[PDB]
């Protein structure tokens, strides 16, 4: 019986890690390194997800930009993030109920699995939307800030976090079907 | 032309990361119908058209159809791009 418990708790901790990645990219400090070292003068952008920093050293807001329909894509993006987090927390909650019975089960665990799948389904869409938006932000001449550095930062690790979220989901739900 | 990159060129690396993650997501769904077993079955799904052995609809077989449509679209787009 120690085996199934180790599997379940391991999956719980893994999804907790995924939540840490969720917080990680939800708290991105610079989602893309950036530069415009114009031979003007040298420039180094550091675009946080809601916080376009420049680097003397400075960080700036710059959120909710062009254009309109894209802003709505940001709405769907953030809503998808919130529901993502909700499915996460419901997952951990169903895990805690499993702990309470460790202190349906199957019928409950699979539910969380499903939600976690849904969670994984949403953020992978969400980031697309975000990346979509980001490309669009680059596509429309980003005011002046159009770095050649263009490369992904913190959130990609969160994409892996959604990956291991689906992974731990599959592992614990397999632990459930093994019953 | 770097050995390898030229094949990679028609479709962007990000798109690859996306198709990979998406497939991984599709993969587990078959297991829901039932970490290794049905994931292996999904490995038996991407390899050939899409999914099998479903006792008429059930649940994930329609996922197999959507996945078939999916891989179909992507490979078509790829070939068109290289062309």
């Amino acid at each position: 019986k120690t085996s199934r418990r180790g599997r379940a708790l391991l999956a719980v901790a893994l999804n907790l890690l995924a939540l840490l990645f969720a917080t990680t990219a939800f708290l991105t400090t610079y989602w893309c390194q950036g530069t415009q070292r114009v031979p003007f003068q040298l420039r180094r952008f550091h675009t946080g997800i809601w916080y376009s920093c420049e680097e003397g050293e400075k960080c700036r807001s710059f959120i909710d930009l062009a254009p309109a329909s894209e802003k709505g894509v940001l709405w769907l993006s953030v809503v998808s993030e919130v529901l993502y987090i909700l499915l996460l927390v419901v997952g951990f909650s169903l895990m805690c109920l499993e702990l309470l019975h460790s202190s349906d089960g199957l019928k409950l665990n699979a539910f969380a699995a499903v939600f976690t799948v849904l969670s994984g389904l949403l953020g992978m869409v969400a980031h697309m939307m975000y990346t979509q938006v980001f490309q669009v932000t680059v596509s429309l001449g980003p005011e002046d800030w159009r770095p050649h550095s263009w490369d992904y930062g913190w959130s990609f690790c969160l994409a892996w976090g959604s990956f291991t979220c689906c992974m731990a989901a599959s592992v614990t739900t397999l632990n459930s079907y093994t019953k | 032309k770097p050995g390898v990159f030229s094949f990679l060129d028609p479709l962007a690396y990000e798109i690859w990361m996306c198709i990979v993650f998406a497939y991984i997501g599709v993969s587990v769904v078959l297991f829901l119908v039932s970490i290794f077993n049905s994931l292996w079955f999904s490995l038996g799904a991407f390899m050939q058209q899409g999914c099998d052995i479903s006792p008429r609809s059930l649940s994930g077989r329609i996922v197999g159809g959507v996945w078939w449509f999916f891989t179909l679209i992507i490979i078509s787009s790829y070939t068109a791009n290289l062309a």
């Binding site: 019928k107 499903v114 799948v117 849904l118 389904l121 992978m124 869409v125 697309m128 990346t131 979509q132 490309q135 | 962007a12 990000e14 798109i15 996306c18 998406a22 997501g25 599709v26 769904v29 829901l32 119908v33 059930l58 649940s59 994930g60 329609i62 996922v63 959507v66 996945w67 999916f70 679209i73 992507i74 787009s77």
Partner: peptide
């Protein structure tokens, strides 16, 4: 990758729909 992302959307949506079907099928039983 956008033009394909639109297909990703229908893919994921089909996934969730099929999941709902799995749910009601778990409801009959």
């Amino acid at each position: 990758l956008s033009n394909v992302a639109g297909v990703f959307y229908i893919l994921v949506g089909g996934l969730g729909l099929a999941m709902l079907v799995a749910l009601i099928e778990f409801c009959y039983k």
